[PDB]
Design a protein around this ligand. Structure first.
Ligand code: HEM
Ligand code: HEM
Ligand SMILES: Cc1cc(N)nc(C[C@@H]2CNC[C@@H]2OCCN[C@H](C)Cc2cccc(F)c2)c1
Ligand SMILES: Cc1cc(N)nc(C[C@@H]2CNC[C@@H]2OCCN[C@H](C)Cc2cccc(F)c2)c1
Ligand SMILES: C[C@H](O)[C@H](O)[C@H]1CNc2nc(N)[nH]c(=O)c2N1
Ligand SMILES: C[C@H](O)[C@H](O)[C@H]1CNc2nc(N)[nH]c(=O)c2N1
Ligand SMILES: [Zn+2]
Lengths: 407, 411
């Protein structure tokens, strides 16, 4: 019932007790591990609210105090009469910070307590949503000196009036299928780009076209808005040694901003809660640029490097991979846009895990996601045992609304 | 029931039914995943069912399930168990069993090869000297002058657990490690404890950076004995780089034959506590782990120094750069000397084809993603993008505790 995790590089053993507080299910059983699988009423609501408020009052060293008991009663009364309840601002901020703290797939959680929460629960329209999101984008970007932020739209009610951002991230590039049979731009965004056009968007029809926002307020049909281009900070990619690298015509955006998740706090569900931090360089250089089903640029780069592409054992892909990632980091750094390399980020996470173990009795972590997609074992996280379990408040994946919405 | 796995690169979806034959536990539960934890005498009572389940699988594989030969073998084994409290495997069942423990090894990326395995039956062995001779022959056969052949040598099974055969070495061939009084390590820091034991047992240590360790062998629960593998049987590769002429002067080499000797082979409930097996290396094991782990040879700095990389900040990716060059050198060196090796691209691509085939012909292929994904360039291999299901099938290879921790010294 008390569990040990060992770091095999340092021999340091940590004891996890925080898992016993875990409630939700992993997908694994005693017979089968699903560690590598990507997607593994008033009666229900009060236990959830109470569990949350208890941990909140505990956190402010007021557990079992009159103010604690009184807020539990107030929330109980409100659930009983209205079928739901409203979080206090203090509770919302606390909840949002803890959802991040609990995100077992996030390597950047050393930062979890520095999160600017924008309360958008008074929002009623998609134009209103657009305004809130522009303000988030501008605040978070901060002229390249990025600041972590979340904007929280109104909570789910009957489920027929959901707020949703249809984009998977606030800022992404369009993808287009060609008569050629090839894909122009980001192949990940083909379906979404089509939905945008089908709603009226006029695609510039290039390789790096920032997508419009498709915002759904109050369960209405979603509406298109272009983010002011001056608010979208992008970085041209060049290499510190390779003159020709700029000729590839590569750029990326500075602000990673996930907009498709569901924030659960005290049993309440926030279906539109875009949040943003700053990039670890491998997400762009390894995944966005080099996944075969993404921009898939390895071949092009390897050729400009004049590497021997005849055999896999020359490690031409691996050489080109490093150079691409060097460029990404150099480019952001030169343009003073916050980025973190995978060495620095994973070192920080180990330090964070140690803090969490001593101050909280553990840190839920998903090794499969935490270990970077390149150079795994030369980062300290590769050698660190991690226990994965689900705590609330939480961010959860939710299905694309276009499958769910009725027009 | 059916469980689906998806490949996020191809959208190919597979369906697992094989997991229903899994009995043993993972370490995980509905509330916790222990996917990244490295380590998450039987009664007649437990033994006959284990035997029966194995014999049922063996007879099905030969298309003789329910035959008289099947039924007679069940009765024979049953009678053997009730009378002697154990039983002996037929040679055919042993071979089948060892091949299947490999097929079932969820952490092994090389399983496309599983049905090609030379099995050396060493169940008539009685002494450490005899173990030494069997292991020499395995090494020579498997090495085959650089054209490596997969092999396993199987010593007598456990009886009362007081008479175990054990190879004390974790691999048949490994280099010594020596802690210096100033706290530095000479040779392989992973082998310091075992080297100290060897020296205590009477080994005269050369005290260099790549001293092949002697074998320490335990027969029939007796105190283990030291033997030096004839050096002419130990194939080694000096590591050089195709473009970098200074790489040779780092003085690196490695041995050609990876031969795991510390695992326990379970077949039909019988336990083979000494079952050394070997195949050939995937390059990254040497170039990434053995050379570049901080707790192993740890060569990254010196390599990057010699490459004149900017080492003042991690974001130059100097470590990543040196890492690729080192792994180029290992592959180049093995290939140039005609010693079998496989790169991580080829091995992972072969594993995906193996896995798809296993799903089609067998109903699944248990795989441990944490181990299958190579320790460099992860997502540029197809396994990174492949969902996997991890579960335990028997026959199996299991980790066992190091024998120096458990051994009753007779003196
Ligand atoms: C401040 C800098 C941050 C860094 C460097 C960082 C790093 C990362 C990385 C590398 C991933 C894996 C992403 C992927 O491979 O798709 C991730 C996942 C995630 N992070 Fe962070 N993070 C940061 C901030 C944040 C913030 C501000 C939040 C929420 C408030 C957050 C919550 C999450 C969640 C929920 C996931 C899993 C996303 C999913 O399932 O797709 N992170 N983080
Ligand atoms: C034929 C060429 C082979 C290749 C390229 C190969 C590749 C590998 C690699 C890279 C690993 C992970 C090793 C590590 O990181 O420590 C591994 C693990 C393993 N393999 Fe293989 N393998 C091969 C043959 C074999 C054979 C012949 C057997 C047994 C008959 C075997 C059984 C195992 C087992 C039991 C593990 C897990 C070891 C442990 O838990 O320490 N493999 N394989
Ligand atoms: C099937 C599926 C499940 C799931 N939980 N997430 C995804 C999204 C998949 C998972 N990795 C690729 C894709 O996400 C891209 C989003 N990554 C962002 C930019 C991470 C990030 C980084 C820094 C700061 C942040 F705030 C957020 C897909
Ligand atoms: C705590 C622990 C548990 C466990 N199950 N194995 C280990 C052994 C750990 C796991 N990775 C580092 C150390 O293995 C070194 C052995 N690797 C061999 C060479 C694999 C191999 C490769 C090719 C062909 C083969 F037959 C065998 C440690
Ligand atoms: C199938 C496998 O789970 C999948 O490819 C995962 C592996 N690890 C990952 N890790 C991160 N950080 N992001 C990802 O998208 C993935 N994809
Ligand atoms: C903590 C973690 O489980 C451990 O470092 C694992 C990760 N993956 C691995 N994968 C392989 N092939 N070999 C290993 O030794 C390890 N070590
Ligand atoms: Zn699991």
């Amino acid at each position: 019932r008390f569990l040990k995790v060992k770091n095999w590089e340092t021999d340091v053993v940590l004891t996890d007790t925080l898992h016993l507080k875990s409630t939700l299910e992993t997908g694994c059983t005693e017979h089968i591990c699903m560690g590598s699988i990507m997607l593994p009423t008033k009666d229900q609501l009060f236990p959830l609210a109470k569990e949350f408020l208890d941990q909140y009052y505990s956190s402010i060293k007021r557990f079992g105090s009159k103010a604690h008991m009184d807020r539990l009663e107030e929330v109980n009364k409100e659930i009983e009469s209205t079928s739901t309840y409203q979080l206090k601002d203090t509770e919302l901020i606390y909840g949002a910070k803890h959802a991040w703290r609990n995100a077992s797939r996030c390597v950047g959680r050393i930062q979890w307590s520095k999160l600017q929460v924008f309360d958008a629960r008074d929002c009623t329209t998609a134009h209103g949503m657009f305004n809130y999101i522009c303000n988030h984008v501008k605040y978070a970007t901060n002229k390249g000196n990025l600041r972590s932020a979340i904007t929280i739209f109104p909570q789910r009610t009957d489920g027929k009036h959901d707020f949703r951002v249809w984009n998977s991230q606030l800022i992404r590039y369009a993808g287009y299928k060609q008569p050629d049979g090839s894909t122009l731009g980001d192949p990940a965004n083909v379906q979404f780009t089509e939905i945008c056009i089908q709603q009226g968007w006029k695609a510039p029809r290039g390789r790096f076209d920032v997508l419009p926002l498709l915002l759904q307020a109050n369960g209405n049909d979603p509406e298109l808005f272009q983010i002011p281009p001056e608010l979208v900070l992008e970085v041209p990619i060049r290499h510190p040694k390779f003159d020709w690298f700029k000729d590839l015509g590569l750029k990326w955006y500075g602000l990673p901003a996930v907009s498709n998740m569901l924030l659960e706090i005290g049993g309440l569900e926030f279906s539109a809660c875009p949040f943003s931090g700053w990039y670890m360089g491998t997400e762009i250089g390894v995944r966005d640029y080099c996944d075969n089903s993404r921009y898939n640029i390895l071949e092009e780069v390897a050729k400009k490097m004049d590497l021997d592409m005849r055999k896999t054992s020359s490690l031409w892909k691996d050489q080109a991979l490093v150079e691409i990632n060097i460029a990404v980091l150099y480019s952001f750094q030169s343009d003073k846009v916050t980025i973190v390399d995978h060495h620095s980020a994973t070192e920080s996470f180990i330090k964070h895990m140690e803090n969490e173990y001593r101050c909280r009795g553990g840190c839920p972590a998903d090794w499969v996601w935490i270990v970077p997609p390149m150079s795994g074992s030369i980062t300290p996280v590769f050698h660190q045992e991690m226990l994965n379990y689900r705590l609330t408040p939480s961010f959860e994946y939710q299905p694309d609304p276009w499958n769910t919405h009725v027009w």
